[PDB]
Ligand binder design. Structure first.
Ligand SMILES: [Zn+2]
Ligand SMILES: [Zn+2]
Lengths: 30, 77, 17, 47, 30, 267
């Protein structure tokens, strides 16, 4: 259970980081 | 609050404690509601900080920014 | 409640807040 | 331990889904805006 | 607004913590 | 100037956002990290400092003195050597009880706290990975209660009676268990018991203050060292106690003189 939770966390963290970076660049476009 | 009561004085310490004490107080606080409090609390508190910052940003921005086969028809006309 | 001092030190503490 | 670990996973999942929604909506909006800006200039005439 | 009211009544003492820090930081800045 | 402020605020809100995400990112790992468990200190990283027993007020002594050629072993010369550290300063435990109470200062091994941290535990491995701390186990409770000893002193002292020893040693196991002892078992129990009662018989006999009790005192200090090192009945210095007893006798004599001539002036 802990390993599954950690894997889900790592995927979520990577997705959130790249999403917020892209949102920053894209709102800087406008 | 006593610091780092190490391992094995208690059975001697309770030798005197039990004769001096008139009333002990024991606290019962589990771990899981505390952890649920940590996760929900950091979520709500950091969203509160984000809300304050985004409100300040949008207000100061809305105030400050307005102050600122190819030679057929070309041979006979 | 289980606060973490750096260099990896776990300290159990009183109830909450 | 399961119900203890659940809310952090859930709140991070909501954060991820909200970020995905915002990014995708902004992507569609900027795509249509840039295409409309190009189409005032290069397409049929315009209004 | 209602789920926000529930969530703020739920975590009252931590909200008072953060508000105390906000007031202290503002008075230290001023 | 305005665009820079707008840009830095619009970047600050997103910096707040990513920092806040990192907070929960560390928080989820924060309740699945625990302190590494040892077997000396059980992960508490502290055991009672045995070289001071936890009291801390250890005795100190000068062992050797490098005296200058032409001086006498006085006390002020020893103090002057202590100033320049030309005398061997050694630490004696307060567990050893001496005839002359030496200066009792703080124990350097624990800095006055009374405990030694578990130096076997190292900084690189002070944390574990197990989520054992969330589900409170049976084994941690049983272990922390396994070092509570169920202190039996409330029966061992009360056990010194022939009928009561008969009861506790023989009758209770024969009734509860439903078995019957062999005669070898009963006789070995009785022999080991009578052999164990030697020290308390000798303590009772030396407690009479009968004449020639110093011989039984040396018998007590000979039969068992560790217990006789802590028995309050045994006096460290015999002439001390003897002359103090004689002095107290003459003191109550002169007290009687005072209390009898105090009643001959009001008449
Ligand atoms: Zn240890
Ligand atoms: Zn010590």
């Amino acid at each position: 259970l802990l390993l599954v939770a950690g894997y889900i966390v790592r995927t979520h963290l990577l997705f959130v980081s790249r999403a917020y970076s892209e949102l920053q660049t894209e709102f800087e476009k406008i | 609050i006593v610091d780092r009561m190490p391992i094995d004085g208690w059975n001697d310490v309770w030798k005197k404690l039990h004769q001096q004490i008139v009333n002990v107080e024991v606290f019962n606080v589990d771990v899981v509601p505390a952890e649920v409090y940590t996760t929900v609390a950091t979520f709500v508190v950091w969203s509160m900080r984000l809300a304050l910052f985004v409100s300040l940003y949008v207000w100061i921005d809305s105030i400050t920014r307005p102050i600122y086969l190819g030679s057929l028809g070309k041979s006979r006309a | 409640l289980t606060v973490l001092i750096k260099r990896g030190i776990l300290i159990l503490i009183h109830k909450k807040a | 331990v399961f119900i203890a670990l659940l809310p952090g996973i859930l709140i991070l999942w909501f954060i991820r889904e909200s970020a995905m929604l915002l990014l995708i909506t902004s992507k569609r909006f900027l795509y249509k805006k840039y295409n409309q800006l190009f189409d005032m200039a290069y397409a049929e005439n315009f209004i | 607004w209602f789920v926000a009211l529930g969530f703020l009544v739920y975590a009252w003492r931590a909200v008072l913590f953060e508000l105390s820090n906000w007031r202290k930081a503002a008075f230290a800045i001023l | 100037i305005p665009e820079f402020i707008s840009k830095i605020s619009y970047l600050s809100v997103f910096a707040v956002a990513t920092l806040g995400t990192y907070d929960i990112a560390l928080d989820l790992g924060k309740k699945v990290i625990c302190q590494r468990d040892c077997k000396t200190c059980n992960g508490w990283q502290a055991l009672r400092c045995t070289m001071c027993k936890g009291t801390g007020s250890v005795h100190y002594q000068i062992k050797d003195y490098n005296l200058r050629s032409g001086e006498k072993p006085t006390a002020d010369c020893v103090a002057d050597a202590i100033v320049e550290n030309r005398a061997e300063l050694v630490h004696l435990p307060s567990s050893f009880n001496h005839s002359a109470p030496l200066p009792s200062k703080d124990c350097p091994t624990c800095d006055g706290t009374g405990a030694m941290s578990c130096t076997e535990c190292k900084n690189k491995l002070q944390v574990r990975i197990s989520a054992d701390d969330i589900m409170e186990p049976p084994w941690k409770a049983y272990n922390v209660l396994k070092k509570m000893d169920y202190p039996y002193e409330h029966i061992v002292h009360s056990m010194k009676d022939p009928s009561i020893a008969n009861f506790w040693l023989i009758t209770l196991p024969q009734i509860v268990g439903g078995f019957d002892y062999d005669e070898d078992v009963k006789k070995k129990i009785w022999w080991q018991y009578e052999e164990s009662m030697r020290y308390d018989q000798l303590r009772d006999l030396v407690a009479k203050r009968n004449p020639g009790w110093e011989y039984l005192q040396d018998a007590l200090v000979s039969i068992d060292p560790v217990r006789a090192r802590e028995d309050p009945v045994i006096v460290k210095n015999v002439p001390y106690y003897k002359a103090k007893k004689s002095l107290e006798a003459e003191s109550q004599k002169k007290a009687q003189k005072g209390s009898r001539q105090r009643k001959w002036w009001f008449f």
